[PDB]
Ligand binder design. Structure first.
Ligand SMILES: *[C@@H]1O[C@H](CO)[C@@H](O)[C@H](O)[C@H]1NC(C)=O
Length: 233
């Protein structure tokens, strides 16, 4: 369970359940690293996704407002990211799951610099594949306030709930759960059950990393110490 400073992230974390979306791109489409290329001690590394040479942890950076920085955005988004997108462990293909049974994402993270978006940097998501929209988008502000925006059904705006406060530079553990049709997030074991409004049990998938919401060019920086996905149906 010791991370290896000499390995790429694929040697220190199970990246067989992830692909990586980057803030660079070509043809207005962002570069994506397939799971097969992330995996292993000799897997992908780049300028925004690399191993901390002091301790083996994962460092993810992302640039601010693309209108200023020129960074690449996914379709439908106006913000740049270095962010992991869940895939099927067997095939490497994009996946999603029903919120029946148990679906959790547990991450130990610290934020070194957050962006100046309304709520700060997005550090985890439950994405509703069924509506091509986020169900829950968790944010970390420059004051260390952790919040979540939950769309009021697929056509509604995000309702914001405060989840906790953690000072910048301090490690914390989050758990995002959408299980037995109940959405909840815990921060250091403090659990908040969240209203899902008019959402009709959408198929979803997890995202985790650094999705920079900045109004200005401010960079964001996230470090990850552990990341685990559980599906038990
Ligand atoms: C969890 O709740 C306790 C008790 O209200 C509080 O002292 C602590 O700051 C909370 N944790 C976070 C990360 O906000």
């Amino acid at each position: 369970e010791f991370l290896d400073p000499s390995c790429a992230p694929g040697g220190n974390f199970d990246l067989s359940v992830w692909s990586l979306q980057l803030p660079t791109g070509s043809a207005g489409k962002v570069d994506t690293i397939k799971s097969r290329d992330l995996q292993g001690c000799n897997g992908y590394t780049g300028p925004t996704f690399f191993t901390d040479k002091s301790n083996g942890e994962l460092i993810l950076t992302a640039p601010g407002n693309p209108d200023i920085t020129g960074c690449a955005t996914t379709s439908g988004s106006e913000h740049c990211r270095t962010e992991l997108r869940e895939v099927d462990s067997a095939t490497g293909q994009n996946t999603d799951w029903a919120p029946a049974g148990t679906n959790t994402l547990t991450v130990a993270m610290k934020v070194i610099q957050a962006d100046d978006g309304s709520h700060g940097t997005a550090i985890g998501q439950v994405f509703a594949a069924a509506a091509s929209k986020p169900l829950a988008e968790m944010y970390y502000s420059q004051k260390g306030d952790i919040t979540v925006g939950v769309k009021q059904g697929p056509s509604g705006n995000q309702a914001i709930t405060k989840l906790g406060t953690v000072p910048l530079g301090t490690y914390f553990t989050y758990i995002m759960s959408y299980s037995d049709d109940v959405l909840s997030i815990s921060i250091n074991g403090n659990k908040t059950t969240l209203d899902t409004f008019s959402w009709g049990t959408p198929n979803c998938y997890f995202k985790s990393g650094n999705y920079n919401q900045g109004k200005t060019a401010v960079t964001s920086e996230v470090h990850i110490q552990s990341i685990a996905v559980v599906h038990d149906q």
